[PDB]
Amino acid sequence: YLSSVSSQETQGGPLAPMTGTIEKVFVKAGDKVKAGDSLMVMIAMKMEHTIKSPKDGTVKKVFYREGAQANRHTPLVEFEEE
Amino acid sequence: YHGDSVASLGTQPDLGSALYQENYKQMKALVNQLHERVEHIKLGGGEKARALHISRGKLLPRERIDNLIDPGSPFLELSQFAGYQLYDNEEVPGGGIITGIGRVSGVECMIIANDATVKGGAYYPVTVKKQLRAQEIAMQNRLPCIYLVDSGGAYLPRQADVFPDRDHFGRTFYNQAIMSSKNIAQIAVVMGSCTAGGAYVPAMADENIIVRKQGTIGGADLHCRKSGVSDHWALDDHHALHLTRKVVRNLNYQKKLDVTIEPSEEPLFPADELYGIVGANLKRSFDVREVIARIVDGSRFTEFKAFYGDTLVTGFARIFGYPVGIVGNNGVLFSESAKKGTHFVQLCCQRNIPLLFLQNITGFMVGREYEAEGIAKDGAKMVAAVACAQVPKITLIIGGSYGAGNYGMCGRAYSPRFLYIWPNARISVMGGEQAANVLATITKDQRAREGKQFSSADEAALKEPIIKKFEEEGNPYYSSARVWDDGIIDPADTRLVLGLSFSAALNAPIEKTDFGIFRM
Amino acid sequence: YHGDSVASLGTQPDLGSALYQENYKQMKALVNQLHERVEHIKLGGGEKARALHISRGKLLPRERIDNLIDPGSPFLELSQFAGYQLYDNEEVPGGGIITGIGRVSGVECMIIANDATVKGGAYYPVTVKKQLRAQEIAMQNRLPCIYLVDSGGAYLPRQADVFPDRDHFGRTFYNQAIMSSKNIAQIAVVMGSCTAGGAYVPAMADENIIVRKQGTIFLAGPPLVKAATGEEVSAEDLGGADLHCRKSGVSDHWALDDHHALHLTRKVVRNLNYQKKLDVTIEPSEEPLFPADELYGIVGANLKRSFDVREVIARIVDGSRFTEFKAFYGDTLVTGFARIFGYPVGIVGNNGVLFSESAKKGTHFVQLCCQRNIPLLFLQNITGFMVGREYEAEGIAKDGAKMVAAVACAQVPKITLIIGGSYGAGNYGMCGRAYSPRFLYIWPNARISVMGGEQAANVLATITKDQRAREGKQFSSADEAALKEPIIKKFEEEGNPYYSSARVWDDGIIDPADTRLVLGLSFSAALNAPIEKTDFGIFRM
Amino acid sequence: YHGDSVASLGTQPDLGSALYQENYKQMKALVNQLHERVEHIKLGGGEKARALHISRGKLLPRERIDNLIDPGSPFLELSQFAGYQLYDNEEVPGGGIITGIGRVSGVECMIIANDATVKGGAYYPVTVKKQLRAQEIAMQNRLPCIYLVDSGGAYLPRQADVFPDRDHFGRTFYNQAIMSSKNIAQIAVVMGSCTAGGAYVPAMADENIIVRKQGTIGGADLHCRKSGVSDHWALDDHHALHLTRKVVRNLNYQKKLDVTIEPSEEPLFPADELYGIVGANLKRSFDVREVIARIVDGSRFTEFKAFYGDTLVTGFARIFGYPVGIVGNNGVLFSESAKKGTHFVQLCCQRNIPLLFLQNITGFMVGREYEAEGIAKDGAKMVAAVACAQVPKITLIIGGSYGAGNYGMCGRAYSPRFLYIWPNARISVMGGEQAANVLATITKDQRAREGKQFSSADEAALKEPIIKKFEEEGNPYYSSARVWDDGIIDPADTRLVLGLSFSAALNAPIEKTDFGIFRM
Amino acid sequence: ADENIIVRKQGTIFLAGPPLVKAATGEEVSAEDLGGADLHCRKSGVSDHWALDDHH
Amino acid sequence: LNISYTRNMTLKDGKNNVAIAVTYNHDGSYSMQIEDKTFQVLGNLYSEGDCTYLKCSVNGVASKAKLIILENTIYLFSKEGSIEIDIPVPK
């Protein structure tokens, strides 16, 4: 626990930070993106949020499109199973 | 056993990254601008006024403060930018008065000195507000007040603003009497002519020191030998300051601490990296944990409820050996964040631990589902918790502060012991661009109700003035011209400023905290 | 033995004297002007706004207050003239809010109601100041607070004067939380659609009452939600009585309409379990021996003439009985003991210029009153310096401060009434607005400023001439005259009672004929809180 | 203005409905059974013992209590069923002691009288527990204690149970001394022979009264004329009671009330309809609002948060002119109900209003979604809010009381001033059938883990003993045989019992309430 | 408790266990899902600290 | 303060509602405006035995009658006649 090992063991599926508008999407219907690559940028409040790839696998589908409303904690990028 | 090894916060930033370079450049430019403006303000009222003041044999106010305090002791000046462009054509460097906290004879005291070079020491409304703020700080922290006096009295222009109001120039005397009743010492040195009826300020003081010839509470000889108003007779400025030091030494006061103390350790990372980490653009987001790691002793932080309401950061740390509870913003506030903040504030109040707020708030989350789950309810109980807290509270605004988020994170209206802002901060009721959309919609709807037609071009034209006005009001200098926000601070000096502020605030004992109804 | 016959103050004025007739005429004109202006202010925001408000099924705020309080009980409205010509082109009748003290279920409570007809209930800076003053009064007197919330939040223009500072909008929530923590009940009645600022008020209140359809509590309105996040939602769905009562749980009571909400509020106040207890002794009340309307002739409207304050005292005290203290020492100041509606009071009035003896006598009387726990009443009539240019005022400074401190440190209830001029440090000495009196009132003929316009004009001309002489610039004699005429006009306009009442200073203006009733109501309200011990600072000498 | 017309609670039940008739029949049978059992208990120790006691010239304990209290004043006996079938073959009517609250010389006092006919006044463990409970009630309510004494001392059988424990027979003396220190009066009348070392009970009492010949503290003549232990000498029982009344009259005590009072008004509906409304079957559910409407002054009730968490009923009413906050159960407890109860308890504590709990609880809602929303968290904070409350709390169990719901609704463990149960109540850790399923599953799983096989018939056979045992333990008489639950009460007398209890409990002043951390 | 520490996997806080939940309402749920360190730390918020094992 | 309080009350006479505007004068009398007509009313309640009587003057005309207020009905008994007025019940 001192070496921060438990800090690394944390993972979760992509989700919308809050309810707001999706300004643009960096992930197409089928694309290969490494983890950390931006998927979409969302502006629900005064700030702006960029979504990073939770995993390096190819994106299966894009649930939302620009100008649409994404509810809180809702999936945006579907990742193909590996 | 205190030897158990504890993990330390913070990480080494990437210096080679272009984002770091750009943020560092912007922050360095802002800090240089602030430093040059502070230098110009420190210059004083003017060359001719300074020449006349020196020709009269008096000492300049900054020289007076330097000679008064202990040798080499740091001085914490407050509201250096008061009156900066506040009035259209009149320049009031520093508001015409100088206030700060320094150590005199080993005792921390609040010093209020009039700058005779600025309008002959006349009191502008901003000067009265600054003096009232200093007196309130001293009363809250139980610090002795020292009033070097060189006043020309109320500025006759804008008399209605200063003489009549409850919070305006009559409160200065009221505070002096109340402080004396509570045993907080009040000492007045008449280093300059009191031409107006400012004679009351020394008379209400417990101890007076008046200079032989410059001092004129109307004759110094008449007052020193006959009126008796004078309790001490001083040959010149240096003698008056020496007498003031002796008087403070004869106070019979000893500072005692309630909180536990530990040896002080420096943070593990340089403070100047905050320039690159934070930058000057509010749109980008930075982890507040870096800021915490660069200002706490040894970069040791004990996070509380890390994974619940992660947009808010809370935990325990120590600054200069003083325990502190840190509450920082990492994003939009939600119900979970409000509940977590309430829980942490209750814990800190129960354990009698000072609280530190770092504001980077952008507002409260708004939505139909959020309203269904009582987001307003959580905001209110979190705000209530902050208001009812009796522990020392210090607020630092490192970024935006808008809407009810300002109230939730110990805004100026909730009486923190000190409030500071960095150069990149913007404060307003709401963001400028959003403010514009709201006004246009209400007017367009009202026209539709009455059958009037609202032109699209007219609505857009209405929005443009709102966007520009909001930016000007939000600028840090605009807020500090008024006495809101105490003083703008260099991020590299945040640790030192916080240490000095907490050391000053620990003079008063910590009282018990009583909470109102917690709306469940 | 309480029979002891006692001499009574006051004398019968000469009605036939021309001076009495002229003073009566001037005072009657002033009072008629005040009454007509108050009527126009009471009219409300406007005809179209009132029509829309009635069409929405809601009750007008004054009707709400009338139905809320006990039947026939008097209502003490505060700061009726707030915002009177304060802003250049915008009319804000009453400041957009209504505040006062009335009896609800036999309990004196402070009532704050928003006037939705004025700018849709938006909060101007004067509105915030008025609400803060009302909250401070309630906290000082330990009066339960009732909020009739119908507001559109802070006025978006002029946001800088309403949001940021300490005495700005957030102080409202701060005071609410503090008073709730101190066992002072907070009750919020959401009678209409609130906003982000309005929403927090019901949340912090101990008990909430929300109307079924008109009441809507949303932390952000539909337009605000759309601006912030681009979300569209109806007002009722986002915030409504049914939703808040059933799912969110913010609402504590559900009301069908305005009358039902007021009835529920009365019941809630009834279930407070509070009993008022008095510390001061009480005696049977007796009316004064002289009519109050003679004050018009006695005082008049000209500040240059001087009148004996003993007449005013004799026309407002029970039975016109007054026990003067130190009558022949410092006769320019009048002090003594009397009773108003059976309440003991210490009266401190001005009869001329203040001197060292007057200051010492006032300090002694204030010490006595604080020791005996007797409420204090100040009647201010400070005099201009036309009679005496300086009079070695340095002597006054040494002793004026003794009174200023004694007044500040006093903990007994203090009520200040300004019946004439109030200038210079005399305002501070006689319990000015800065020294936290429980209530402050002014008569229509009062004048307040740092100094008289004529005196100020002379001071400015002399300072400029002397500075110019050292500079070597000749100061024109014509220039001195040029500076004097504008200064006199500015001081007169600023000193007007309506100028001071437009700002929240000096609460409201009162007809002199109603002074006794106003003082009785104010003291009855202020006696709710217990009287604490008084601690004094170091009295010089 | 208190005239304001107000709507009244309650509705007229349908007498012709068969359900009402059946419920009325069952409740009437239960009440008749209770009355006959109470009569038999009141009969006393036995015929021969009573004959011997009368032959000795002494008065029977109930006659002593009747003569002691003011003429016609009601007497509130406590724990009449203590020791009912508690021991296998020994009969202990009333536990061997009599305790209650009555008015002596216009002062409410707690009376403890030993029944010499039961085992010669020897102290069974249940007797010690009953006396300790009475002493605790008196200490909490600041009521003077009067101890008519006719004790044979500790029962030598089961000596380990009574003499050694902290809560066992040594606490009786400790309580007497503490009450004297707090100025709560302690008066002892030795109306009977103290053969054992019960001499301590009069010695520790502030005032003693000893009868000439019957009373021994070892000789009455030796003690009265020489030992001096006696502060008063009485010829017989009547003289001793008269002296006790005089001594109480010389106490110099005046009762003062803190809560406001209003004129008392009777409820709008007959109390006997509660028999039909409630019945005797716990499976059926009844609206607690009927019970509230039949026991409050004028049937006036001000519901609080009516539509939020409707399974819990809270509001304000008045009983005999005493303000009260009623908290009743209308179904399963949920998160909303817990939050609403916490809010109401906070309000009542803030306003210093006595609380009344009506228990018809069946447990806490259990489920994965409920656990996700912190049902346990909401239960905990209500449990805490109830525990930290300092206002007088009275709990009445009108139905089932199981699981943590008992703790939440001011169970016996949370120190209510009084606790009563109606004849239909059942109290257990969980329902018996439910307990049965839980035990069988754990054993079957454990066998599966170790490779053992659990027969289906064996699991069912294991469940049957559990079902029968739970029912026997839950019976109201079983609980009242132990001193849990004070006394079983006739529902028709609920209003009178509550009025007497609140009048007694209002003697002590109401202190401020301090709450722990509210785990938001 | 003022402060809670729950182990990642061994620690499980449920107001009613799986067998108890089934007995009361006939609902089937795993022990970790009904009560677990991750759940209590992240969604229910009962847990105040998250620990990997006993030593931590 | 500086205003005259006017109270709007509704009284049901027979089957038709009637609205009355009552003004509380400083001198203690009341000015009631019904439809387009105004009346100056003053009086007091004095109890004889167990019966409460109302002595009042309406527009300078004085009269006495026994006053009974039972439930939401007002009973005025006098030699000239008997009057029953129903106070509306809030919903």
Ligand SMILES: CC(C)=CC(=O)SCCNC(=O)CCNC(=O)[C@H](O)C(C)(C)COP(=O)(O)OP(=O)(O)OC[C@@H]1O[C@H](n2cnc3c(N)ncnc32)[C@@H](O)[C@@H]1OP(=O)(O)O
């Ligand atoms: C509390 C209550 C209840 C009441 C009161 O307090 S009522 C107080 C009445 N005040 C006096 O009675 C002091 C009158 N001053 C003097 O007697 C002197 O002046 C001194 C003592 C000020 C020393 O100053 P000095 O004489 O050594 O130098 P000077 O350059 O002349 O100083 C600057 C020049 O003063 C002009 N100036 C403008 N406004 C004021 C002002 N309000 N007071 C003084 N001076 C003012 C300035 O405009 C010009 O310079 P500028 O702006 O033209 O460049």
Ligand SMILES: CC(C)=CC(=O)SCCNC(=O)CCNC(=O)[C@H](O)C(C)(C)COP(=O)(O)OP(=O)(O)OC[C@@H]1O[C@H](n2cnc3c(N)ncnc32)[C@@H](O)[C@@H]1OP(=O)(O)O
């Ligand atoms: C506390 C913190 C920390 C933050 C905040 O609080 S941020 C609050 C943001 N406010 C809102 O989000 C409310 C937006 N209003 C509305 O949603 C409605 O309007 C209502 C609810 C107000 C009802 O009013 P309504 O709709 O029934 O009638 P309307 O005539 O339209 O009412 C008057 C018209 O409002 C215009 N108007 C001007 N200034 C404002 C203003 N500040 N607020 C509202 N309206 C304003 C006025 O100029 C015009 O009339 P005029 O001047 O043209 O004649």
Ligand SMILES: CC(C)=CC(=O)SCCNC(=O)CCNC(=O)[C@H](O)C(C)(C)COP(=O)(O)OP(=O)(O)OC[C@@H]1O[C@H](n2cnc3c(N)ncnc32)[C@@H](O)[C@@H]1OP(=O)(O)O
């Ligand atoms: C506090 C500390 C720290 C220590 C102590 O306190 S150590 C106390 C030691 N006790 C004595 O020293 C008193 C010894 N009694 C006697 O001196 C008398 O008896 C009297 C005074 C009790 C009057 O009673 P009595 O004499 O008038 O009538 P009796 O019928 O005889 O009364 C019933 C008969 O007493 C039998 N019996 C059974 N158990 C006891 C018991 N514990 N005490 C007394 N009697 C008991 C009962 O079984 C039988 O009747 P039964 O059950 O056979 O039908």
Ligand SMILES: O=CCCCC[C@@H]1SC[C@@H]2NC(=O)N[C@@H]21
């Ligand atoms: O900074 C951008 C949004 C701030 C205002 C958003 C509205 S205004 C008041 C209300 N309370 C908040 O904190 N947010 C909303």
Ligand SMILES: O=CCCCC[C@@H]1SC[C@@H]2NC(=O)N[C@@H]21
């Ligand atoms: O009366 C039925 C028993 C249900 C309560 C028993 C306790 S309460 C919380 C926990 N959950 C259960 O189902 N049983 C226990």
